[model samples]
Target: TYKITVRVYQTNPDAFFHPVEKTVWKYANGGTWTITDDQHVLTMGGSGTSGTLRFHADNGESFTATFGVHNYKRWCDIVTNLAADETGMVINQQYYSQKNREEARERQLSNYQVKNAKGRNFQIVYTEAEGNDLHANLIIG
Candidate 1:
């Protein structure tokens, strides 16, 4: 199994919270992830094609991250603690396919990097890790 690293950051403490980079290592296969940093709480787990990670702040703010993977294909989406009528709010969701590289050049779109809106703005950048693993960095406000 390979190793994967994830660095999570929060711009606005009121929106989301987590350690800058706890330096934990997750195997490419599967394992338990229970992390408690300074103030917030984070937990991760899954199997096969389903995966999930949750974030909870000390002040009751939270978010849910749902992702899936099958072989070389993957997809992800995040839900925040905001009301449906809120303005400047956006959902960060996306899927990945190797064919996107070619199709995007030909005439299409690549959802590798996605972002949310205004006050609850956020960005996620996922890249190739060692071997078949992947690493990701997330910044949320």
Candidate 2:
């Protein structure tokens, strides 16, 4: 099992942002994660290779996001990429690649699109730390 810390922040047109919600999950293969909103209760599968976070609005509109993960010499590197899946969510990637100092080790960014919902998007950043715990930050407008 591993501890994944997810911090979601609200963003504006300017660079200023603030935290909205923070969550942590104990994750393992085949385990299900539980989360709830005012009227909706939902669960998501847990695999260190990839995971999803859903944004639900009060009016019943929702978006399920699947993120990519990179295994760098045994460490989990959570990445950004909003890909489409049959489940109405994004599918994450677990590709292995060696890293270099200048080019390879630089933090990578993924540009994603919500096919059905236009003009709404977000960004994810995996904070680099040397430990067994995973950290991620999201900015959603």
Candidate 3:
């Protein structure tokens, strides 16, 4: 098993947006982490495999954040404990209005295409945004 840890520090404590920014800092470190808007640079450091990380801010109130990555038997254990069955099926039978159904259908089709592509795989990438959660990604085989 392997693990990665990151930490961020804020220089300006009295700056505006401190509360919200602090929340952002916490969630950014606690949850899925990625560079957002180019505001911060993440530096990783450790000795013999254990140490700390420094997050350098480019603008706004300086704050600190940390992230850690560790190897586990399963990623699902972190989010949910439900056992997965490969042959199981989940059906949504609720009725939707025409407009809603059309939109849902479009999205379903798009997802299906992406999932069915030959030799393709699925990947999700996340990014942080000031006062919001945002992410971007690419799909390839």
Candidate 4:
């Protein structure tokens, strides 16, 4: 059994809330997740081929991350192909992949809302501790 820990820090006290990153690691063999910070303790259990890490900030700010062996392998292959393309075709090809499609949509929505709001400020930092590890902190200011 292996364990992972995540830590978050907020730099702006008055800024709008939003997630910095999500799905940092996805385990193909299934695992448990426990979140601990200066103010909160959260625990989750799951048994599936894929697991995800998600983050949300106050005031409707959110970010979701999904990491799993499946996605990692796919991403690695896609990046390799993209790097080999001098004509940018690889980029265009991968941009439309099914997996990337969802990410693109989410990114577009996030950008649109951020632009329209014009007053949202948020930052998130994350770290992972592996293998029966426990200990995380969140500093908010």
Candidate 5:
């Protein structure tokens, strides 16, 4: 199998509770890449497509930063998108989770609602401009 490593950084310069930001490298598929450190970004499904980093925040109960691999990421995008049908957007979304090869993470579909993927969870946000039939936006909490 492959390996993916994560690096955590506190983005806040001053008093931010959890300024911790984690970089997860996806190898089973992957990222733009951490592009720094021990060159952990996978070349194939061999180094590490999966791993976790424990960021012990100032808070006692902290977080485990995790991510996937890289090289396979582009391929997952192509294959998942190519296999598109009605659920195409989500299938592709699923293809990109840490379980897949992930992103900031958003997935959308056409037909606004043929029982689509976006409005199913969040309120129907009038996001983006016209002509983007599949308008999905996701922000992690």
Candidate 6:
């Protein structure tokens, strides 16, 4: 099995929380994923033909990532190098798969990167964590 590297970004943090590019690796055929320091966990299990990425950050944030095999050979790379990877898979618009216990509030749309895909890649960037309420914006250019 071939190994693929991916970068992860947590949606939000509490008082003093921040997002960073954490590198994780997974198998081409699909396997387990653990960050550089195992602080984050992305799992590849029986979910889809291309495979599924269930990401859990040590700091208390999470999401389930999936992609088209034609566009994303490995699911782990979907969120990696999104601005730099000329060719990469697209993450669908789904509310945060997981979140820490807390009250729902305004979402912080992750206006981080894009290209040809543009806003299409992040329509599902926000979350409610309650009844799956969330938000996002579109910028076509």
Best candidate, lDDT-wise?
A: 1
- Model 1 misses residue 44 by how many Å? 11
Q: Count the clashes in each prediction.
A: 0, 0, 7, 7, 19, 1
lDDT for position 70 in model 4:
26
lDDT of 2: 0.36
Roughly what TM-score does model 4 have, to 2 decimal places? 0.35
Reference-based lDDT, each prediction: 0.39, 0.36, 0.21, 0.31, 0.28, 0.28
After superposing candidate 6, which stretches have Cα over 4 Å from the reference? 14-30, 38-49, 55-62, 67-141
At residue 100, what lDDT does model 6 achieve?
19
RMSD of each: 9.1, 9.2, 18.3, 12.1, 13.8, 15.4
Better of 2 and 3 by TM-score: 2
Across 1-141, the per-residue lDDT of candidate 5 in tens digits comes to 432222222334332223223233444343333334633232334423433322222423232222332332211121111221313223333434555335422232211211112211111222322331212221111
Which 10 residues in a row give candidate 5 its minimum summed lDDT? Answer: 110-119
RMSD versus native structure for model 5:
13.8
- Quote each prediction's TM-score: 0.46, 0.43, 0.17, 0.35, 0.27, 0.26
Lowest summed lDDT over 10 consecutive residues: which window, candidate 4? 73-82
Q: Model 1, range 1-141, lDDT digits (tens) per residue?
A: 322344576777455454222211132344433343422222223222323455556665555443333343333445555344321112211222235322322321112333333335555455542233545556666
lDDT of 2 by residue, 1-141 (tens): 333445656564433333222222323343333333311111223333334455544433344443332232112222222244322222222122223311222333333333225344565555633334545555565
Determine which window of 10 residues in candidate 3 has minimal summed lDDT: 73-82
For 8-105, candidate 4 gives per-residue lDDT tens digits of 55666654444332232232344444344432222223212222333444554433323222221211111111122222232323334557733542
lDDT per residue as tens, model 6, 25-141: 233345444555433333443322232354333543333333212222222112422333211122222212223100011122233333222222322222221111112221111
Q: Residue 37 of model 4: what lDDT?
A: 49
Better of 3 and 4 by TM-score: 4
The pairs that clash in candidate 3 are 8-64, 8-65, 9-63, 9-64, 10-62, 10-63, 10-64
- Measured with C-alpha atoms, the lDDT of residue 1 in candidate 6 is 29
Q: Residue 98 of candidate 1: its Cα lDDT?
A: 37
Flag clash pairs in model 1: none
Mind sharing the TM-score for model 2? 0.43
